[PDB]
Every structure is written in structure tokens, then in C-alpha cells.
Amino acid sequence: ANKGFLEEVRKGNLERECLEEPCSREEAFEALESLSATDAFWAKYTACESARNPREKLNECLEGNCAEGVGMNYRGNVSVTRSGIECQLWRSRYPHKPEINSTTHPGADLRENFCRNPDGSITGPWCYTTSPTLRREECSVPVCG
Ligand SMILES: *[C@@H]1O[C@H](CO)[C@@H](O)[C@H](O)[C@H]1NC(C)=O
Ligand SMILES: [Sr+2]
Ligand SMILES: [Sr+2]
Ligand SMILES: [Sr+2]
Ligand SMILES: [Sr+2]
Ligand SMILES: [Sr+2]
Ligand SMILES: [Sr+2]
Ligand SMILES: [Sr+2]
Ligand SMILES: [Sr+2]
């Protein structure tokens, strides 16, 4: 957190610098090493600033199974929509070409055909659908607590 005074002369540490204190991306970055690791992190972090306290609710929100807020932190496995349709490969370009991928929103675990919300859309974690008919649509992901 930089509570000043030769604290930056010591090894980076995630518990202590970011889980235990609020942190700058540069603090994570120093504590995490790899940057791909720092993109994923930040993304989870930044979607969990609304649930930083208790520090038990933060562990729930970073875990990724439940959705908090509009669930930009959802990192779970639900893959079929609200209508029941099944999601498209974010990787895939058919039947609809995604405009958000990995290149665009990389903190965001766009793995498989999983529900995600790179975008923080108001109606929650969603995905691209199979139906040539319907492009994208909300998913029914569990809510945190
Ligand atoms: C979206 O990501 C794919 C990789 O799967 C890439 O080939 C495509 O060019 C990207 N589209 C945009 C963001 O340019
Ligand atoms: Sr620090
Ligand atoms: Sr500190
Ligand atoms: Sr540091
Ligand atoms: Sr601790
Ligand atoms: Sr401290
Ligand atoms: Sr630095
Ligand atoms: Sr520093
Ligand atoms: Sr370092």
C-alpha cells in the first residue's frame, strides 16, 4: 500500500500488499511477476473493490464461482443462457463474430463458451449464442452470498 519508508526495499507479496491492503497495479505487478498473471489479477481485483470488506467476502468474490455486482468477476463454468440456448466459443467466429475476445478484454477469462461480462453489462454474465437468431444474451449465474 506504500505506507512509505523503505517498505519498497522488500520482496513483493500479494497477501500483504493487495489482499491485506488496497494496491496499485504496480504493486500487484511487483508481487505477481508475469504480466499475463497481473492482467488476470487486476481484472478480478477491480471487479471486487465493491466487496473488499469483510476480507471473507473478498475471498468469495475473487474465487469467481458466485457473481457480485453485475458479475464482472464471475470466473465459473455456466455455459448455457437464460433462454437455455448454449453459448458460442469466444474463440469461434460463427454463427456470430465476437467483438470482445482476449486481445480486447484479456483480464477476462474468455475460456471455452463460458458466461463472462467483459463489459459489465447491466443484466450480468452473458455470452454469445448459438442461435444465428440471437447474438448475445444473459446467463443465470449464482449471486455471491
Ligand atoms: C478477436 O480475437 C481473435 C482471436 O481468437 C482474433 O483473431 C480477432 O482478430 C479478434 N478480433 C478483433 C478484436 O480484432
Ligand atoms: Sr507496497
Ligand atoms: Sr504496505
Ligand atoms: Sr512492492
Ligand atoms: Sr493475512
Ligand atoms: Sr499492513
Ligand atoms: Sr515498479
Ligand atoms: Sr513499488
Ligand atoms: Sr519484484
PDB file of C-alpha atoms and ligand atoms in Angstrom:
ATOM      1  CA  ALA A   1       0.000   0.000   0.000  1.00  0.00           C
ATOM      2  CA  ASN A   2       3.053   2.322   0.300  1.00  0.00           C
ATOM      3  CA  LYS A   3       2.605   3.468   3.858  1.00  0.00           C
ATOM      4  CA  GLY A   4       6.038   4.995   2.996  1.00  0.00           C
ATOM      5  CA  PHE A   5       9.509   4.384   4.462  1.00  0.00           C
ATOM      6  CA  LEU A   6      11.843   1.726   2.967  1.00  0.00           C
ATOM      7  CA  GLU A   7       8.893  -0.687   2.549  1.00  0.00           C
ATOM      8  CA  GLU A   8       9.691  -0.869  -1.203  1.00  0.00           C
ATOM      9  CA  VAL A   9      13.144  -2.313  -0.380  1.00  0.00           C
ATOM     10  CA  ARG A  10      11.461  -5.675   0.286  1.00  0.00           C
ATOM     11  CA  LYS A  11      10.036  -8.623  -1.687  1.00  0.00           C
ATOM     12  CA  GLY A  12       6.700  -8.159  -3.394  1.00  0.00           C
ATOM     13  CA  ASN A  13       3.896 -10.005  -1.698  1.00  0.00           C
ATOM     14  CA  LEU A  14       0.289 -10.397  -2.687  1.00  0.00           C
ATOM     15  CA  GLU A  15      -1.306 -11.273   0.687  1.00  0.00           C
ATOM     16  CA  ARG A  16       0.288  -8.346   2.459  1.00  0.00           C
ATOM     17  CA  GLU A  17       0.227  -5.595  -0.374  1.00  0.00           C
ATOM     18  CA  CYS A  18      -3.067  -6.263  -2.100  1.00  0.00           C
ATOM     19  CA  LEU A  19      -5.305  -8.713  -0.176  1.00  0.00           C
ATOM     20  CA  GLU A  20      -4.292  -7.126   3.104  1.00  0.00           C
ATOM     21  CA  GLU A  21      -4.200  -3.556   1.793  1.00  0.00           C
ATOM     22  CA  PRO A  22      -5.623  -1.880  -1.262  1.00  0.00           C
ATOM     23  CA  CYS A  23      -2.920  -1.834  -4.001  1.00  0.00           C
ATOM     24  CA  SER A  24      -1.834  -0.115  -7.221  1.00  0.00           C
ATOM     25  CA  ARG A  25      -1.479  -2.255 -10.355  1.00  0.00           C
ATOM     26  CA  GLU A  26       2.272  -1.624  -9.916  1.00  0.00           C
ATOM     27  CA  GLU A  27       2.107  -3.179  -6.511  1.00  0.00           C
ATOM     28  CA  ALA A  28       0.378  -6.326  -7.888  1.00  0.00           C
ATOM     29  CA  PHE A  29       2.773  -6.264 -10.772  1.00  0.00           C
ATOM     30  CA  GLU A  30       5.791  -6.336  -8.452  1.00  0.00           C
ATOM     31  CA  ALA A  31       4.141  -9.001  -6.314  1.00  0.00           C
ATOM     32  CA  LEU A  32       2.997 -11.088  -9.278  1.00  0.00           C
ATOM     33  CA  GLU A  33       5.948 -11.186 -11.734  1.00  0.00           C
ATOM     34  CA  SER A  34       4.398 -12.310 -15.055  1.00  0.00           C
ATOM     35  CA  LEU A  35       2.130  -9.755 -16.640  1.00  0.00           C
ATOM     36  CA  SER A  36      -0.499 -12.076 -18.064  1.00  0.00           C
ATOM     37  CA  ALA A  37      -0.816 -13.024 -14.378  1.00  0.00           C
ATOM     38  CA  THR A  38      -1.135  -9.323 -13.497  1.00  0.00           C
ATOM     39  CA  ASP A  39      -3.857  -8.788 -16.139  1.00  0.00           C
ATOM     40  CA  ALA A  40      -5.992 -11.662 -14.861  1.00  0.00           C
ATOM     41  CA  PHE A  41      -5.441 -10.473 -11.252  1.00  0.00           C
ATOM     42  CA  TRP A  42      -6.242  -6.826 -11.764  1.00  0.00           C
ATOM     43  CA  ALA A  43      -9.448  -7.809 -13.613  1.00  0.00           C
ATOM     44  CA  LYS A  44     -10.566  -9.962 -10.642  1.00  0.00           C
ATOM     45  CA  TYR A  45      -9.424  -7.219  -8.191  1.00  0.00           C
ATOM     46  CA  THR A  46     -11.088  -4.317  -9.952  1.00  0.00           C
ATOM     47  CA  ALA A  47     -14.392  -6.309 -10.130  1.00  0.00           C
ATOM     48  CA  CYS A  48     -14.082  -6.973  -6.401  1.00  0.00           C
ATOM     49  CA  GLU A  49     -13.428  -3.469  -4.964  1.00  0.00           C
ATOM     50  CA  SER A  50     -17.104  -3.426  -4.007  1.00  0.00           C
ATOM     51  CA  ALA A  51     -16.529  -6.451  -1.759  1.00  0.00           C
ATOM     52  CA  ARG A  52     -13.117  -5.801  -0.209  1.00  0.00           C
ATOM     53  CA  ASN A  53     -14.728  -5.980   3.271  1.00  0.00           C
ATOM     54  CA  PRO A  54     -15.153  -8.232   5.018  1.00  0.00           C
ATOM     55  CA  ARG A  55     -11.934  -9.947   3.900  1.00  0.00           C
ATOM     56  CA  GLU A  56     -14.022 -13.110   3.810  1.00  0.00           C
ATOM     57  CA  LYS A  57     -16.363 -11.693   1.182  1.00  0.00           C
ATOM     58  CA  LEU A  58     -13.303 -10.690  -0.872  1.00  0.00           C
ATOM     59  CA  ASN A  59     -12.110 -14.286  -0.771  1.00  0.00           C
ATOM     60  CA  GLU A  60     -15.596 -15.292  -2.071  1.00  0.00           C
ATOM     61  CA  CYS A  61     -15.529 -12.623  -4.866  1.00  0.00           C
ATOM     62  CA  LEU A  62     -12.005 -13.331  -6.052  1.00  0.00           C
ATOM     63  CA  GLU A  63     -12.689 -17.151  -6.047  1.00  0.00           C
ATOM     64  CA  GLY A  64     -15.041 -16.440  -9.011  1.00  0.00           C
ATOM     65  CA  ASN A  65     -17.907 -19.022  -8.584  1.00  0.00           C
ATOM     66  CA  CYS A  66     -20.698 -16.579  -7.496  1.00  0.00           C
ATOM     67  CA  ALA A  67     -21.434 -13.197  -9.190  1.00  0.00           C
ATOM     68  CA  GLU A  68     -21.020  -9.954  -7.258  1.00  0.00           C
ATOM     69  CA  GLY A  69     -22.311  -6.615  -8.574  1.00  0.00           C
ATOM     70  CA  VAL A  70     -23.088  -7.294 -12.285  1.00  0.00           C
ATOM     71  CA  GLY A  71     -20.577 -10.163 -12.000  1.00  0.00           C
ATOM     72  CA  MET A  72     -17.550  -8.924 -13.975  1.00  0.00           C
ATOM     73  CA  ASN A  73     -15.740 -11.227 -11.526  1.00  0.00           C
ATOM     74  CA  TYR A  74     -17.668 -14.318 -12.489  1.00  0.00           C
ATOM     75  CA  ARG A  75     -14.957 -16.853 -13.479  1.00  0.00           C
ATOM     76  CA  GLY A  76     -17.139 -20.017 -13.225  1.00  0.00           C
ATOM     77  CA  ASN A  77     -18.368 -22.709 -15.615  1.00  0.00           C
ATOM     78  CA  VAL A  78     -22.059 -21.895 -16.565  1.00  0.00           C
ATOM     79  CA  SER A  79     -22.249 -22.164 -20.316  1.00  0.00           C
ATOM     80  CA  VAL A  80     -25.916 -22.059 -21.319  1.00  0.00           C
ATOM     81  CA  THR A  81     -28.026 -18.901 -21.373  1.00  0.00           C
ATOM     82  CA  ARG A  82     -31.234 -17.654 -19.780  1.00  0.00           C
ATOM     83  CA  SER A  83     -33.247 -18.845 -22.776  1.00  0.00           C
ATOM     84  CA  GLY A  84     -31.466 -22.241 -22.442  1.00  0.00           C
ATOM     85  CA  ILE A  85     -29.509 -21.787 -25.633  1.00  0.00           C
ATOM     86  CA  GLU A  86     -25.822 -22.747 -25.493  1.00  0.00           C
ATOM     87  CA  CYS A  87     -23.003 -20.263 -25.731  1.00  0.00           C
ATOM     88  CA  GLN A  88     -20.563 -19.859 -28.546  1.00  0.00           C
ATOM     89  CA  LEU A  89     -16.798 -20.234 -28.394  1.00  0.00           C
ATOM     90  CA  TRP A  90     -15.478 -16.737 -27.704  1.00  0.00           C
ATOM     91  CA  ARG A  91     -12.645 -18.149 -29.755  1.00  0.00           C
ATOM     92  CA  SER A  92     -15.048 -19.018 -32.639  1.00  0.00           C
ATOM     93  CA  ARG A  93     -16.263 -16.630 -35.308  1.00  0.00           C
ATOM     94  CA  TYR A  94     -19.546 -18.412 -36.220  1.00  0.00           C
ATOM     95  CA  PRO A  95     -22.548 -18.076 -36.015  1.00  0.00           C
ATOM     96  CA  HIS A  96     -21.652 -14.592 -34.746  1.00  0.00           C
ATOM     97  CA  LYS A  97     -18.291 -12.862 -34.685  1.00  0.00           C
ATOM     98  CA  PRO A  98     -17.392 -11.635 -31.198  1.00  0.00           C
ATOM     99  CA  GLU A  99     -16.059  -8.061 -30.926  1.00  0.00           C
ATOM    100  CA  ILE A 100     -14.650  -8.609 -27.483  1.00  0.00           C
ATOM    101  CA  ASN A 101     -12.148 -11.532 -27.423  1.00  0.00           C
ATOM    102  CA  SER A 102      -8.861 -11.948 -25.498  1.00  0.00           C
ATOM    103  CA  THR A 103      -6.979  -9.367 -27.437  1.00  0.00           C
ATOM    104  CA  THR A 104      -9.619  -6.830 -26.374  1.00  0.00           C
ATOM    105  CA  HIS A 105     -10.506  -7.798 -22.764  1.00  0.00           C
ATOM    106  CA  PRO A 106      -7.701 -10.078 -21.566  1.00  0.00           C
ATOM    107  CA  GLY A 107      -8.043  -9.851 -17.798  1.00  0.00           C
ATOM    108  CA  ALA A 108     -11.373 -11.568 -18.555  1.00  0.00           C
ATOM    109  CA  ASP A 109     -11.223 -15.388 -18.730  1.00  0.00           C
ATOM    110  CA  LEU A 110     -12.878 -15.875 -22.064  1.00  0.00           C
ATOM    111  CA  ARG A 111     -12.192 -19.663 -21.964  1.00  0.00           C
ATOM    112  CA  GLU A 112     -14.475 -22.066 -23.795  1.00  0.00           C
ATOM    113  CA  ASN A 113     -18.019 -20.903 -24.346  1.00  0.00           C
ATOM    114  CA  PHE A 114     -18.360 -19.765 -20.671  1.00  0.00           C
ATOM    115  CA  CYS A 115     -20.617 -16.827 -19.421  1.00  0.00           C
ATOM    116  CA  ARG A 116     -18.381 -13.725 -18.575  1.00  0.00           C
ATOM    117  CA  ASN A 117     -19.382  -9.995 -18.940  1.00  0.00           C
ATOM    118  CA  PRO A 118     -16.031  -8.419 -20.110  1.00  0.00           C
ATOM    119  CA  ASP A 119     -18.190  -5.378 -20.433  1.00  0.00           C
ATOM    120  CA  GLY A 120     -20.055  -5.010 -17.077  1.00  0.00           C
ATOM    121  CA  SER A 121     -23.391  -5.072 -18.906  1.00  0.00           C
ATOM    122  CA  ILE A 122     -26.253  -4.289 -16.522  1.00  0.00           C
ATOM    123  CA  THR A 123     -28.057  -7.573 -16.886  1.00  0.00           C
ATOM    124  CA  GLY A 124     -24.917  -9.716 -15.753  1.00  0.00           C
ATOM    125  CA  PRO A 125     -22.592 -12.510 -17.054  1.00  0.00           C
ATOM    126  CA  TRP A 126     -23.505 -13.364 -20.638  1.00  0.00           C
ATOM    127  CA  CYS A 127     -22.115 -14.896 -23.773  1.00  0.00           C
ATOM    128  CA  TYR A 128     -22.552 -15.240 -27.460  1.00  0.00           C
ATOM    129  CA  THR A 129     -25.266 -17.644 -28.546  1.00  0.00           C
ATOM    130  CA  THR A 130     -25.529 -20.424 -30.998  1.00  0.00           C
ATOM    131  CA  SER A 131     -28.823 -19.164 -32.458  1.00  0.00           C
ATOM    132  CA  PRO A 132     -27.923 -17.399 -35.666  1.00  0.00           C
ATOM    133  CA  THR A 133     -31.137 -15.801 -34.450  1.00  0.00           C
ATOM    134  CA  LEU A 134     -29.886 -14.291 -31.190  1.00  0.00           C
ATOM    135  CA  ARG A 135     -26.416 -12.848 -30.942  1.00  0.00           C
ATOM    136  CA  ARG A 136     -25.795 -12.462 -27.198  1.00  0.00           C
ATOM    137  CA  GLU A 137     -27.847 -12.954 -24.069  1.00  0.00           C
ATOM    138  CA  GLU A 138     -27.685 -13.085 -20.283  1.00  0.00           C
ATOM    139  CA  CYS A 139     -26.873 -16.204 -18.288  1.00  0.00           C
ATOM    140  CA  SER A 140     -28.257 -17.253 -14.829  1.00  0.00           C
ATOM    141  CA  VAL A 141     -25.232 -17.265 -12.570  1.00  0.00           C
ATOM    142  CA  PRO A 142     -25.439 -17.582  -8.810  1.00  0.00           C
ATOM    143  CA  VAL A 143     -25.098 -14.425  -6.751  1.00  0.00           C
ATOM    144  CA  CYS A 144     -22.432 -14.031  -4.015  1.00  0.00           C
ATOM    145  CA  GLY A 145     -23.841 -14.776  -0.578  1.00  0.00           C
TER     146      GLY A 145
HETATM  147  C1  LIG B   1     -10.709 -11.325 -31.686  1.00  0.00           C
HETATM  148  O1  LIG B   1      -9.832 -12.396 -31.251  1.00  0.00           O
HETATM  149  C2  LIG B   1      -9.436 -13.315 -32.301  1.00  0.00           C
HETATM  150  C3  LIG B   1      -8.632 -14.427 -31.667  1.00  0.00           C
HETATM  151  O2  LIG B   1      -9.446 -15.516 -31.307  1.00  0.00           O
HETATM  152  C4  LIG B   1      -8.670 -12.523 -33.362  1.00  0.00           C
HETATM  153  O3  LIG B   1      -8.291 -13.439 -34.408  1.00  0.00           O
HETATM  154  C5  LIG B   1      -9.579 -11.440 -33.917  1.00  0.00           C
HETATM  155  O4  LIG B   1      -8.839 -10.668 -34.861  1.00  0.00           O
HETATM  156  C6  LIG B   1     -10.038 -10.514 -32.804  1.00  0.00           C
HETATM  157  N1  LIG B   1     -10.978  -9.526 -33.303  1.00  0.00           N
HETATM  158  C7  LIG B   1     -10.709  -8.199 -33.177  1.00  0.00           C
HETATM  159  C8  LIG B   1     -10.757  -7.775 -31.714  1.00  0.00           C
HETATM  160  O5  LIG B   1      -9.892  -7.644 -33.959  1.00  0.00           O
HETATM  161 SR    SR B   2       3.660  -1.506  -1.277  1.00  0.00          SR
HETATM  162 SR    SR B   3       2.452  -1.935   2.595  1.00  0.00          SR
HETATM  163 SR    SR B   4       6.182  -3.631  -3.776  1.00  0.00          SR
HETATM  164 SR    SR B   5      -3.248 -12.155   6.168  1.00  0.00          SR
HETATM  165 SR    SR B   6      -0.263  -3.746   6.525  1.00  0.00          SR
HETATM  166 SR    SR B   7       7.949  -0.928 -10.366  1.00  0.00          SR
HETATM  167 SR    SR B   8       6.668  -0.013  -5.857  1.00  0.00          SR
HETATM  168 SR    SR B   9       9.528  -7.512  -7.707  1.00  0.00          SR
END
